[PDB]
Amino acid sequence: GSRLEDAVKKTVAENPVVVYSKTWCSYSSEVKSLFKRLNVDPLVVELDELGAQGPQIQKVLERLTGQHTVPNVFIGGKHIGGCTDTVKLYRKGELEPLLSEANAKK
Ligand SMILES: *SC[C@H](NC(=O)CC[C@H](N)C(=O)O)C(=O)NCC(=O)O
């Protein structure tokens, strides 16, 4: 449990952009397409592809972020929110500077 939380923290530290996703979730597909359009290749973790570990990671995500929905987006190691939250930062002109500060590749 503490190791899993640590693993999540490491994951978001190791990758400029992390998207905790489900393959079937339209909002996740939508935020993935935004990143594609901004020439960013995020680390995508598909919770529905991880079997028993999926709900365990979600428990950690709710504790760390206050969010129970997917996609759960992190940039530069910081929680962003979901698809609508990410798109808000985009419209506000804040997302691209965050991506460059996070050293997002591509
Ligand atoms: S597609 C699966 C669901 N995702 C959302 O409803 C995300 C909505 C946010 N506004 C966003 O990311 O844009 C989901 O995670 N449902 C699970 C639940 O408990 O409702």
Q: How far is the CA of 53 from the centre of ligand 1 (A)?
A: 19
Angle, alpha carbons 71-72-73 (nearest 5°): 105
Residue boundaries of the structural domains of the chain: 1-106
Other beta carbons within 10 Å of 7: 11
Phi-psi region of 93 (alpha: psi -120 to 50; beta: other; left: phi over 0): left
What resolution (Å)? Answer: 1.8
- Does ligand 1 have an atom closer than 6 angstroms to the CB of 70? yes
Helix ranges restricted to H, the chain: 2-14, 26-37, 53-65, 83-91, 95-101
Strand, helix or coil for residue 78: strand
Residues 6+ apart with CB under 8 A from 95: 38, 75, 86, 89
Q: Which atom of ligand 1 is nearest to the CA of 25?
A: 1
Lookup: tokens for 3 = 């190791």
Residues 6+ apart with CB under 8 A from 103: 16, 76
Other beta carbons within 10 Å of 76: 17
Residues 6+ apart with CB under 8 A from 31: 19, 71, 73, 82, 83, 86, 87
Please state whether beta strands 43-46 and 17-21 pair in parallel, antiparallel, or not at all (unpaired): parallel
- Does ligand 1 have an atom closer than 6 angstroms to the CB of 83? yes
- Does ligand 1 have an atom closer than 6 angstroms to the CB of 25? yes
Tokens 């002109």 locate to 93
Q: Which residues pair with 81 in a beta bridge?
A: 73
Other beta carbons within 10 Å of 63: 11
Please give the CATH topology (third level) of the domain spanning 1-106. Glutaredoxin (3.40.30)
Decide: residue 103, CB within 10 A, 0-12 exposed, 13-18 middle, 19+ buried.
Answer: exposed
DSSP H or E run through 79: strand 78-81
Q: How far is the CA of 97 from the centre of ligand 1 (A)?
A: 26
Complete DSSP assignment for 49-67? GSTTHHHHHHHHHHHHHS-
